[PDB]
Amino acid sequence: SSESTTFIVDVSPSMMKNNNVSKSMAYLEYTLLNKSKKSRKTDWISCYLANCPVSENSQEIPNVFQIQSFLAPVTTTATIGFIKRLKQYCDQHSHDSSNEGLQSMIQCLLVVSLDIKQQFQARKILKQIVVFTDNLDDLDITDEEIDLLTEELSTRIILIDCGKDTQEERKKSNWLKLVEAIPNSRIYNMNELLVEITSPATSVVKPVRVFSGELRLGADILSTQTSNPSGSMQDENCLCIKVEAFPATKAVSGLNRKTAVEVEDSQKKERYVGVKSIIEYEIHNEGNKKNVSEDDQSGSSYIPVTISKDSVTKAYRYGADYVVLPSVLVDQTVYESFPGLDLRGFLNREALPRYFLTSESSFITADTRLGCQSDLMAFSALVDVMLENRKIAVARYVSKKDSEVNMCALCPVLIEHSNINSEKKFVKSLTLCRLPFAEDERVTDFPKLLDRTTTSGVPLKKETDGHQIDELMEQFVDSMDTDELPEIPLGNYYQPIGEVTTDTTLPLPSLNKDQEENKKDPLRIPTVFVYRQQQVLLEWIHQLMINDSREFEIPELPDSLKNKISPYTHKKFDSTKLVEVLGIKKV
Amino acid sequence: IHEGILFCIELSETMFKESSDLEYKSPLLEILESLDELMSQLVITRPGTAIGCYFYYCNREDAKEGIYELFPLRDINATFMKKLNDLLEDLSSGRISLYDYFMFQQTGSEKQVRLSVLFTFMLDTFLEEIPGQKQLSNKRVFLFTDIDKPQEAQDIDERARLRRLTIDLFDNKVNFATFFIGYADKPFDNEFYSDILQLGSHTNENTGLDSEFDGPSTKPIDAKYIKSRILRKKEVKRIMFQCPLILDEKTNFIVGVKGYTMYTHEKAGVRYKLVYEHEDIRQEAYSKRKFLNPITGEDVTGKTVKVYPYGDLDINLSDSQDQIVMEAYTQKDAFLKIIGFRSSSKSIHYFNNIDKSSFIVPDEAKYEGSIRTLASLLKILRKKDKIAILWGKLKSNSHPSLYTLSPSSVKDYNEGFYLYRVPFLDEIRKFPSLLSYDDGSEHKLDYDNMKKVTQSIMGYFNLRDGYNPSDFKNPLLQKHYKVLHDYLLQIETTFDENETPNTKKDRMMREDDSLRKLYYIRNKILESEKSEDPIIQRLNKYVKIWNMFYKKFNDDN
DNA sequence: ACACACACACCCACACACCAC
DNA sequence: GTGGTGTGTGGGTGTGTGTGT
Numbered sequence A: 001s002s003e004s005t006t007f008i009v010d011v012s013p014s015m016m017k018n019n020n021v022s023k024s025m026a027y028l029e030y031t032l033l034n035k036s037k038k039s040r041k042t043d044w045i046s047c048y049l050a051n052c053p054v055s056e057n058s059q060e061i062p063n064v065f066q067i068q069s070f071l072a073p074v075t076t077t078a079t080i081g082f083i084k085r086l087k088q089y090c091d092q093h094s095h096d097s098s099n100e101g102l103q104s105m106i107q108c109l110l111v112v113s114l115d116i117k118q119q120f121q122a123r124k125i126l127k128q129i130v131v132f133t134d135n136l137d138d139l140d141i142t143d144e145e146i147d148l149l150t151e152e153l154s155t156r157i158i159l160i161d162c163g164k165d166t167q168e169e170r171k172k173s174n175w176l177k178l179v180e181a182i183p184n185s186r187i188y189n190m191n192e193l194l195v196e197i198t199s200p201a202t203s204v205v206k207p208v209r210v211f212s213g214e215l216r217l218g219a220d221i222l223s224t225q226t227s228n229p230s231g232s233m234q235d236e237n238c239l240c241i242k243v244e245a246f247p248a249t250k251a252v253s254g255l256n257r258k259t260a261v262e263v264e265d266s267q268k269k270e271r272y273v274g275v276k277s278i279i280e281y282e283i284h285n286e287g288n289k290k291n292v293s294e295d296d297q298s299g300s301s302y303i304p305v306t307i308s309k310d311s312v313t314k315a316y317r318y319g320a321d322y323v324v325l326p327s328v329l330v331d332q333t334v335y336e337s338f339p340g341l342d343l344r345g346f347l348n349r350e351a352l353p354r355y356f357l358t359s360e361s362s363f364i365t366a367d368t369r370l371g372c373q374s375d376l377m378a379f380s381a382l383v384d385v386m387l388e389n390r391k392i393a394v395a396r397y398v399s400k401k402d403s404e405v406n407m408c409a410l411c412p413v414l415i416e417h418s419n420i421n422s423e424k425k426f427v428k429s430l431t432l433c434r435l436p437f438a439e440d441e442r443v444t445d446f447p448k449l450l451d452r453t454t455t456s457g458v459p460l461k462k463e464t465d466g467h468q469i470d471e472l473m474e475q476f477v478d479s480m481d482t483d484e485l486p487e488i489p490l491g492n493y494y495q496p497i498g499e500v501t502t503d504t505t506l507p508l509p510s511l512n513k514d515q516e517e518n519k520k521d522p523l524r525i526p527t528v529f530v531y532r533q534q535q536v537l538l539e540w541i542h543q544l545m546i547n548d549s550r551e552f553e554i555p556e557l558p559d560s561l562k563n564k565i566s567p568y569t570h571k572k573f574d575s576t577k578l579v580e581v582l583g584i585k586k587v
Numbered sequence B: 001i002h003e004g005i006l007f008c009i010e011l012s013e014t015m016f017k018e019s020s021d022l023e024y025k026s027p028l029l030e031i032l033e034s035l036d037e038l039m040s041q042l043v044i045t046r047p048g049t050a051i052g053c054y055f056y057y058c059n060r061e062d063a064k065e066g067i068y069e070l071f072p073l074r075d076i077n078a079t080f081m082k083k084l085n086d087l088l089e090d091l092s093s094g095r096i097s098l099y100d101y102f103m104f105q106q107t108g109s110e111k112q113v114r115l116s117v118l119f120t121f122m123l124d125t126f127l128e129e130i131p132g133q134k135q136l137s138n139k140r141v142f143l144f145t146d147i148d149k150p151q152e153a154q155d156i157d158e159r160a161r162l163r164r165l166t167i168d169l170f171d172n173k174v175n176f177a178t179f180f181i182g183y184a185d186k187p188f189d190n191e192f193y194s195d196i197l198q199l200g201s202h203t204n205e206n207t208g209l210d211s212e213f214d215g216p217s218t219k220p221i222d223a224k225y226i227k228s229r230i231l232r233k234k235e236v237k238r239i240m241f242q243c244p245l246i247l248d249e250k251t252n253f254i255v256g257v258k259g260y261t262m263y264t265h266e267k268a269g270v271r272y273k274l275v276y277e278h279e280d281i282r283q284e285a286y287s288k289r290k291f292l293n294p295i296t297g298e299d300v301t302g303k304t305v306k307v308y309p310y311g312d313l314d315i316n317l318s319d320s321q322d323q324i325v326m327e328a329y330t331q332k333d334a335f336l337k338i339i340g341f342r343s344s345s346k347s348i349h350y351f352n353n354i355d356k357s358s359f360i361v362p363d364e365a366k367y368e369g370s371i372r373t374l375a376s377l378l379k380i381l382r383k384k385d386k387i388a389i390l391w392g393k394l395k396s397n398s399h400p401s402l403y404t405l406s407p408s409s410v411k412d413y414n415e416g417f418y419l420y421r422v423p424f425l426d427e428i429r430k431f432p433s434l435l436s437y438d439d440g441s442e443h444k445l446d447y448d449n450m451k452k453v454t455q456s457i458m459g460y461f462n463l464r465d466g467y468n469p470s471d472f473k474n475p476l477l478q479k480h481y482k483v484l485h486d487y488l489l490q491i492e493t494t495f496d497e498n499e500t501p502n503t504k505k506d507r508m509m510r511e512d513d514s515l516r517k518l519y520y521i522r523n524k525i526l527e528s529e530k531s532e533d534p535i536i537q538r539l540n541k542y543v544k545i546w547n548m549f550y551k552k553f554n555d556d557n
Numbered sequence C: 001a002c003a004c005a006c007a008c009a010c011c012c013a014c015a016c017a018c019c020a021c
Numbered sequence D: 001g002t003g004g005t006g007t008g009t010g011g012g013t014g015t016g017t018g019t020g021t
Helices: A013-017 A020-038 A076-092 A105-120 A143-152 A175-181 A190-198 A327-333 A373-388 A468-479 A528-546 A559-563 A577-582 B027-042 B078-093 B115-127 B157-171 B191-197 B223-231 B319-327 B370-383 B444-460 B475-489 B501-511 B514-528 B538-554
Strands: A003-010 A043-050 A064-071 A128-133 A156-161 A186-189 A211-217 A239-247 A258-262 A272-274 A281-286 A302-307 A312-318 A321-323 A340-348 A362-366 A391-398 A406-417 A425-435 B003-010 B049-056 B068-075 B138-145 B174-182 B239-248 B253-261 B272-278 B281-286 B305-309 B335-343 B358-362 B386-393 B401-407 B417-421
Touching: A003 A020, A003 A105, A013 A020, A020 A043, A020 A076, A020 A190, A020 A528, A043 A076, A043 A105, A064 A076, A064 A105, A076 A528, A105 A128, A105 A143, A143 A175, A156 A175, A156 A190, A175 A186, A186 A190, A239 A373, A239 B538, A281 B272, A312 B475, A321 B475, A327 B475, A340 A406, A340 B514, A362 A373, A373 A391, A373 A406, A373 A425, A373 B444, A373 B538, A391 A425, A391 B514, A468 B370, A528 A559, A528 B319, B003 B027, B003 B068, B003 B115, B027 B049, B027 B078, B027 B223, B049 B115, B068 B078, B068 B115, B078 B475, B115 B157, B115 B174, B157 B174, B157 B191, B174 B191, B174 B223, B239 B370, B253 B370, B335 B401, B358 B370, B370 B386, B370 B401, B370 B417, B444 B538, B475 B501, B501 B514, B514 B538
Parallel strands: A003 A043, A003 A128, A128 A156, A156 A186, A211 A340, B003 B049, B003 B138, B138 B174, B239 B335
Antiparallel strands: A043 A064, A211 A239, A239 A362, A258 A272, A258 B305, A281 A302, A281 B281, A312 A321, A312 B272, A340 A391, A362 A425, A391 A406, A406 A425, B049 B068, B239 B253, B253 B358, B272 B281, B335 B386, B358 B417, B386 B401, B401 B417
16 A cells, blocks of 8 residues: 655664664664665655754754655665765764753654644555654653644554663553554564564565366366356256465565666766667578688588568477478367366375475465355365365366366365454365376386395395494484474464555564464575575675675674574484595595 | 487287287287387477387398388387378278288298397497487387297307397497286296396406496286386486485585486477478578667677666675675585484475475485495385485575475385475465355354265265376377377368267367366266165265255355 | 576566546 | 556566586
8 A cells, every 4th residue: 555654763862872773773774775675656754863962954843853854765775875864963963962951752753743744634645653762761741742642643653662671570651651542553672673674574475366266076078168158057966166276385586686787877886777678580591602621611600680570480399390380270289278176086195196296386265256155165164074084186177268287186274364253263275286197207217225236137235234324324314303393283384364464564573472483393494595685685785885884794694594504403423434434534 | 318219029929919818909019009109108208219110020021131120210200100000000990910911920930030130230220320310319129029039049159149249239328128028828938038138247356346237127027018118118217416415514424316307297389499481491590589778789798797686776796795695505516415304294295385396316426325325314214204304406506495305105116215395484375365254163063064965975086096197198288299290190180060069078088188087077976866776876965965055055145 | 419497587468456537 | 427557466488507428
């Protein structure tokens, strides 16, 4: 949609002494740089500096300075400039020009509120205020101004306490009374935000729907495979369930690059312009010449000529013949298919070898936008019985009319939804993964390993003992065992997209208490290459563009990310025997 | 890359003789049918394969002193497939018989071929350089023989000469794939061919290393398996990756590993060629495709750079910095590192597949002790329901990833490991947002009744054998290559405007292999509704009952 | 001396949201 | 009073890599 976030960072000496202004600056840089890459046209940014010793404003309101006006879209150059300007302003009045007497930072909110009203007024875009403060109890708020702020502001207040000084006893007031006053308000601690910005930020992709049709068992191929209403809706003895399909696992490509050419510009900014992609077709016409030479002159020698694609036709290969078909035969070459999920039969999970599955998975679920409660109940019962009997169905699956027909395995799966009710609900679905055809099979004969023989089949007695190496390998595998780590239960592996949607795109450390301890499965790890590239780009921007350092000091991979791509350790065990027997010496 | 097969079929009195176990199919006819089917399959999956077919001893007038070729060692083409199909059709229709076609009659043990000239011809055929096709990278001879004790079997010096010829052929990388035919009434004693086809006897020192190859497996095969033995040997294994497997790098425990693709994804129009036709002259065309910005116009190829976009900022990382960036999580070359081991249930799932599995075998040609170490690893990982978590990249110019390495079960023929890819957190997608959730949360009785009905239906439709890839040809591939085949052979197309309702289902069940199974499923329900038996009649009512529970909710309002 | 199959760039549509000429 | 943008997401297509013997 359209949102707007406003940053109000305290610059009081209490914030500066414990380095809280630097933490605020780093978090602001991270969030603004993450906003800059998307560069949404409907995401507004504004920054105010509060409790400053001096300030220049047109409104003549002291101790409040608007460093950044309302900006959209936020660009990387704009963010770099804003962060450098913030550094300059903070260093300008860091300690030399300290003020005397405390100032009402809360009042600084009120004027900001007017600006928030002034910029948008009637439009219903989301508005929020992000404020960084050192202490909450030291500030004073007028009782009569609370109602004025509540009636004037319709914006959610997000308060981040930058202080790390809390006693065993806990007591809260002031700001909390404001937090209760304005709905959708909340409080955070700066350490949580600093932790969250350093963790790998996983992406969230909204499901689309890749298929809509019917899952049918026992339908007649006459009515479901004709240029007519091609379902089993007209049935008297068969199983038909309205069904839709969504992506389940899809291979993410790494952060791409732009093939660009350097421009010679007087401004000396090292500018790169992206190239265009134009496709041409060229042929090589032979040429006859008679030149005196001892060689045969059989090297590559032709004249290239570019002709448009309208004069180039596709020649299909059959054995050793490349044939160009007429238009009618090319039309007949396409297989006429019709979308649907035709069940063949049900086999056990172990009766289906794991290597058979050769494609990305997809959710199959009861269609609720064109179906009814009947489809939902039937599909839930089907998935329940498949799960109970450990069945996996084999099916003929077509997604579009003129689309390839696949074979697929349907695995009964259930996804845990918290739901408005206290009791959690396991939503039932199928998971569809393609199975190989006859032409997909590549299985050949490989030489044996355990009791390996010669080519003719004469056994080869390996080594002289099979106790030492076997025991070594068994203890080695026990040493690197990762079964002490738990496994995420079946039901939370796939997460509902609604539970990962938030009212704003602001980086916050998650509103779900169940997100704790989400990093203990060795197999479920973030995209290391994607996060590594993002971290390198962020650090390059931070060091060269704003800090103006002189050499990119490459950051090390984070320990949490490094741990999952590094060998584990259950118990210690020494496998030095191989090197000890081989012997290390400089020859 | 380029492979060649030489079918060499030895005619005998029992060869033309049909078999009761083979259901009125002669071994020679079975071999011809298998060869035709194999050529049809290879024109789809692996074209550019040379196949020759030769028969001996043939008294037929067209011969080479008894070596009659059904077709020479050329790349697969439509003409030879049509030539084989015409012969098969003549045999089936009864216009000609195998006895008549080969001019072979039961006249008291007709002349047998001398094996010396046979192996000389086998060497000559591969050594010849036919101008049409490039040199064969792989060479194989499929030897079909029913005479285990020829004239050369009783000699000794002739055995030495034959063994010398076998060694000479093997030195030219020609590998024999024997199809010795052994019947229940007459076993095939392979001692003679076992002696001839091996590399003789040779000694290096007293305890020195010996030859790693002992020649072809001279184990005879039963006739009923002939076809099963041919189609399963049409394709060599193609190596997908060859990477070091690093078990412990602190103690330098690193072996070699080879990886192949078990099941690919075949698509219809992948193999093609851009041809430019002018008047009556056809030539091949190239498709560059160079990226140039029209505003500049200057040379672009070799002068462009790749820069990371971060909005309106372009980040031009130097190579010396990019390499250090990458080295933080991956090595330069293709590798796999064993990160950990864990139970099979905790890592092996059917709903979290994202890629194609691969098959891994030891590679002892680089890292000594790879085979013995990997055999022990395979034993241990199979002993417990355990796998090995692997981190790394199967190719140097590929992304690092997590994989699961599982020991291959004892049920299948191959020994090795299966490498699946583990989906990353980004790759795992989100379950959609449904518009309703009122399935059976307040209808436990009706939901349970429908559960019972659906389970009852599911119980009988169980697949006994399981999924077999060979029982499902790709319908798009079949239709595409059928159109190509019929255009090349000039065969009139079907689908006239006078189609009938039975004609439609007959065409549908022949164009598609799965549609035949679906018609069987429908016909089972149709038959159950008519069966007078109280047991067979159930499969109707179950389905019938189900259609009520659907309509109980579908059309209430 | 040579066929497949990834990863890598950019390029095409459709769905669904918002918002109005 | 109901069509235009705008984006996101998926799917398509040359290309430069890569197996060894």
